[PDB]
């Protein structure tokens, strides 16, 4: 089968992150399921295995009480809670599946793992995005080309596309990833080349559009007078 | 190093790869001079194996 | 933690690559079976081997999976253009009261060749200037590989605050492109003559200034 997590989510540095574990069909309330991390720049942990069948939370010695996942047998879907998030949970987790065997081993092997939900924590939360436009000027302009764009600064979270006349420009279009800021803010860039005829007969928008804050602003460029 | 006026080792080329062993022994810290120079001796070590 | 592994290793694309996995003597070498997994930056990992002795469904017979004594190794014939991965140790650990992975190799010796990069200096607009805030932006594009160290002057001392530096993405072209920015405030954006970015490229170091009066 296949079990599929939900997508990104980003909290609060003190709050409760409440995520779940679908699966697709049956052969859930059979097996154990645990939960296995992996974060960037370390190892995989492990925090716990659940059984669904009777109900044992099997957890390790590294982990202290501070996460519970429970589990539910009428719609097979799997529930992780966790509170009093730190500053390096930032973090991935996965739907693992425990099928025991015999033999002189006799070690826990994922067989089967889920999708992934990337859970982010940090500073700098929500607020609105700004948008800057970008003209080109006459030095800058050499050839018969000329690059200009939107510049997107104080927003969060990820992540947001960027469209050009509501994805009718394709040509020569390019999105910039973003960066960490000191403040713990993300920025980036989309610049796309045009021919110089087309400077005075035909505008350009940028589109920005944000799912989690729900904040659609569109901003119209329009080029420099003096330079 | 150009910022740091010590003598630091980073090119660690003794081997590639070692895939099974059984011995492993750890023996007394001993501290070492990294700066090497162009004048006379002043220590005599002798080792025999 | 308790299991160490090699940071990366080096390889041919025809002979034989092995790999080693050591830990201590009562969670790999007590009795407890070996299992190697893929991670893929990019997808979800999945099972390939499960006690060194059976093969799942779904994975080629290449990997070979033994245990000698207190180390585990994995050996591999051939690389084909899939094994641009890490590669783990996942065994249970009774000190530990549950399982724990390694540390990871790397198996990637390069394929990055050069070129000549191109830079793009652009001054802040003027509605910019009223959010009391001045984002100096320099957008690098055509270049490879994606390997550029940013710098920034103004005529007098290099700046050392407010640097960043994203990392480089794929083009359609096969090419990679970057922008840094700078956070400066209006009030001294206006007191210095000029500002520019200074990247270098190999030896190649282009430079682009600009005049805000």
């Known amino acids: 089968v296949q079990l599929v997590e939900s997508g990104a989510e980003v909290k609060k540095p003190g709050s409760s992150v409440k995520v779940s574990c679908k699966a697709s069909?049956?052969?859930?309330?059979?097996?154990?399921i645990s939960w296995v991390r992996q974060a960037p720049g370390q190892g995989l942990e492990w925090m716990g295995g659940?059984?669904?069948?009777?109900?044992?939370?099997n957890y390790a010695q590294k982990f202290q009480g501070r996460v519970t996942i429970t589990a539910d047998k009428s719609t097979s879907t799997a529930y992780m809670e966790l509170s009093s998030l730190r500053s390096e949970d930032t973090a991935v987790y996965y739907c693992?599946?425990?099928?025991?065997?015999?033999?002189?081993?006799?070690?826990?092997?994922?067989?089967?793992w889920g999708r992934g939900t990337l859970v982010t924590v940090s500073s700098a939360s929500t607020k609105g995005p700004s948008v800057f436009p970008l003209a080109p000027s006459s030095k800058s302009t050499s050839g018969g080309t000329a690059a200009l764009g939107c510049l997107v600064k104080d927003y969060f979270p990820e992540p947001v596309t960027v469209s050009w006349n509501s994805g009718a420009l394709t040509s020569g279009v390019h999105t910039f990833p973003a960066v960490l800021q000191s403040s713990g803010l993300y920025s980036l860039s989309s610049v796309v080349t045009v021919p110089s005829s087309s400077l005075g007969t035909q505008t350009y928008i940028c589109n920005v559009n944000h799912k989690p804050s729900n904040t659609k602003v569109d901003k119209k460029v329009e080029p420099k007078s003096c330079d | 190093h150009k910022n740091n006026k010590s003598w630091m080792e980073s090119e660690f080329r003794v081997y590639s790869s070692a895939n099974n062993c059984t011995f492993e022994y750890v023996s007394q810290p001993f501290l070492m001079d990294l700066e090497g120079k162009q004048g006379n001796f002043k220590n005599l070590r002798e080792f025999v194996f | 933690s308790v299991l160490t592994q090699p940071p990366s290793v080096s390889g041919a694309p025809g002979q034989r690559v092995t790999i080693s996995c050591t830990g201590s003597?009562?969670?790999?070498?007590?009795?407890?079976?070996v299992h190697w997994y893929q991670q893929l930056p990019g997808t979800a990992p999945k099972l390939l081997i499960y006690?060194?002795?059976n093969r799942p469904s779904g994975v080629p017979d290449r990997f070979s999976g033994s245990k000698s004594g207190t180390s585990a190794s994995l050996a591999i014939t051939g690389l084909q253009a899939e094994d641009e991965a890490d590669y783990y140790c996942?065994?249970?650990?009774?000190?530990?009261?549950?399982?724990?992975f390694g540390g990871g190799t790397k198996l990637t010796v390069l394929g990055q060749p050069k070129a000549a990069p191109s830079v793009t200096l652009f001054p802040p607009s003027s509605e910019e200037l009223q959010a009391n805030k001045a984002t100096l932006v320099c957008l690098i594009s055509d270049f490879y590989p994606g390997a550029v160290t940013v710098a920034w002057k103004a005529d007098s001392s290099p700046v050392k605050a407010g640097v960043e530096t994203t990392t480089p993405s794929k083009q359609s072209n096969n090419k990679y492109a970057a922008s840094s920015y700078l956070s400066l405030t209006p009030e001294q954006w206006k007191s210095h003559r000029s500002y520019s970015c200074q990247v270098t490229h190999e030896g190649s170091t282009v430079e682009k200034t600009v005049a805000p009066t």
């Open positions: 003597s009562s969670n790999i070498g007590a009795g407890y079976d």
């Open positions: 659940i059984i669904p069948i009777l109900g044992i939370a």
């Open positions: 006690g060194n002795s």
């Open positions: 996942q065994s249970y650990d009774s000190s530990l009261s549950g399982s724990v």
């Open positions: 693992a599946r425990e099928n025991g065997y015999s033999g002189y081993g006799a070690a826990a092997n994922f067989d089967l």
């Open positions: 069909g049956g052969t859930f309330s059979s097996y154990a």
